Amino acid sequence: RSPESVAFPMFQSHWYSG
Amino acid sequence: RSPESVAFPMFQSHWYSG
Amino acid sequence: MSQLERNIETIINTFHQYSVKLGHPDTLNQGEFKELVRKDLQNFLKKENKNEKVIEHIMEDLDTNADKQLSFEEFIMLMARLTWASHEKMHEGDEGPGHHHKPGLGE
Amino acid sequence: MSQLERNIETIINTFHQYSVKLGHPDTLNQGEFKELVRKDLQNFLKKENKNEKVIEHIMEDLDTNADKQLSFEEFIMLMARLTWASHEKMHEGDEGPGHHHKPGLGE
Amino acid sequence: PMLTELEKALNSIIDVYHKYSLIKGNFHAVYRDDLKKLLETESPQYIRKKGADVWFKELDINTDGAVNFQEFLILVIKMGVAAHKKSHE
Amino acid sequence: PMLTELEKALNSIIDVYHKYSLIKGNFHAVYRDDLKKLLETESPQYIRKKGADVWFKELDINTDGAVNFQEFLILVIKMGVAAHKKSHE
Ligand SMILES: *C(=O)c1ccc(C(=O)O)c(-c2c3ccc(=O)cc-3oc3cc(O)ccc23)c1
Ligand SMILES: *C(=O)c1ccc(C(=O)O)c(-c2c3ccc(=O)cc-3oc3cc(O)ccc23)c1
Ligand SMILES: [Ca+2]
Ligand SMILES: [Ca+2]
Ligand SMILES: [Ca+2]
Ligand SMILES: [Ca+2]
Ligand SMILES: [Ca+2]
Ligand SMILES: [Ca+2]
Ligand SMILES: [K+]
Ligand SMILES: [K+]
Ligand SMILES: [N]
Ligand SMILES: [N]
Ligand code: NA
Ligand code: NA
Ligand code: NI
Ligand code: NI
């Protein structure tokens, strides 16, 4: 498989929130 | 010692010549 | 598709196999990471896989934002480390001269 | 001068101690590198130092332009690797939780 | 035993780098010209469009005129992160 | 045995990084704000003048919002190369 439009949302909170 | 003006030449040929 | 792109594809596809199972579909939680590691790093991480707590510290270490999941950005650090540790083992105790590879990790 | 700058100073001063002895004064040849390693990496490279041929492959590996001397740019790769391998040993077999350091390399 | 496909993938990344590092010179050194061949052959357009010299300057962190294996892993990491984001377009 | 000064130097670089990585969060993660404190306290002016955010973008190779130890070693390597060149001025 060539991953195109995996269609679920990408995780994007690449930072500390603790 | 805090190396300042070590006064001999720095090597500078950072590339392949073989 | 090049050899490198294919290898990259396999890392992404393997991450996605376990990230979608529970919780956030684009991240690996503790249980999904344990599963990926048990199955698809079964040789490279043979010794670590015998100690569930070692596997837990590894995940804690990779989880750089401390949100208890591995993003893909966090995960590819483990792939780079294992690739680097495999190449190191190919050169372990090397005496030279020139270049030669012994068997890598998990071998 | 900060702690890091001082440490950087010590790497540069140690390189210069052996680079000036023969040939190019700003590079380490095989003999100067063997001397630096025998003396100032005597603990971190204890096992490698018992095999002059292992020391020769290390130098061959660091000598990225293949001119048979180590520039300072080539040498600081070995310092980064040994620093990284020391931190790895502090965490070898870590089970967690949290952060703790065992003794590092050469200990 | 037989390696998993993921493990074979990681070893193959080693193999890829060495196709270019073993062309000449130091066996773990990819010189500027070798790096252009690597990018053009192994990477997609959205990686190559950066230019092989801009990549070389980025990857040669010790400015010794070569990309060693750990420096090449910087390239691999950035390609993986980019490939992953693209898979969500 | 007792470590050489060079070996103590390398271990101390580990120690330096952890002053900032152990401030909060992941124990091997230096977040953007911690990295400004690190640069301002540990690096000279000709390093700092780059700006802590330009350094953060350079060092965070996997763009996960943190500088781990191997990414910090990129900073250490660049400072060493720079410090060496300055010693020939
Ligand atoms: C995605 O399209 C995909 C999924 C699985 C495979 C596979 O494991 O074989 C591939 C893939 C090939 C697909 C078709 C084909 O004719 C030949 C293929 O060769 C390979 C070779 C490797 O090493 C990995 C993947 C494939 C593609
Ligand atoms: C260069 O100026 C230099 C050379 C040697 C030393 C040393 O090994 O002690 C230092 C240096 C100091 C110099 C003077 C002083 O009063 C205190 C010093 O403390 C240290 C501490 C460490 O850890 C390394 C170097 C010095 C300076
Ligand atoms: Ca998940
Ligand atoms: Ca995380
Ligand atoms: Ca010399
Ligand atoms: Ca050289
Ligand atoms: Ca380099
Ligand atoms: Ca990072
Ligand atoms: K994804
Ligand atoms: K010098
Ligand atoms: N927090
Ligand atoms: N050469
Ligand atoms: Na080469
Ligand atoms: Na931290
Ligand atoms: Ni090799
Ligand atoms: Ni640590």
Residue numbers in the entry:
A (entry chain C), B (entry chain C): 2 to 19
C (entry chain B), D (entry chain B): 7 to 113
E (entry chain A), F (entry chain A): 2 to 90
Show the paper's wording.
Common inflammatory disorders such as ulcerative colitis and Crohn’s disease are non-invasively diagnosed or monitored by the biomarker calprotectin. The peptide uniquely binds the calprotectin tetramer, which enabled robust and sensitive quantification of a defined species of calprotectin by ELISA and lateral flow assays in patient samples, and thus offers an ideal affinity reagent for next-generation inflammatory disease diagnostic assays.
The X-ray structure showed that peptide 3 binds in an elongated conformation, covering a large surface of 951 Å2. The binding region running over both heterodimers explains why peptide 3 binds to the tetrameric form but not to the dimer. The peptide forms seven H bonds and one charged interaction with calprotectin. Several amino acid side chains, including those of the key residues Phe8, Met10, and Phe11, bind to small cavities to form hydrophobic contacts.
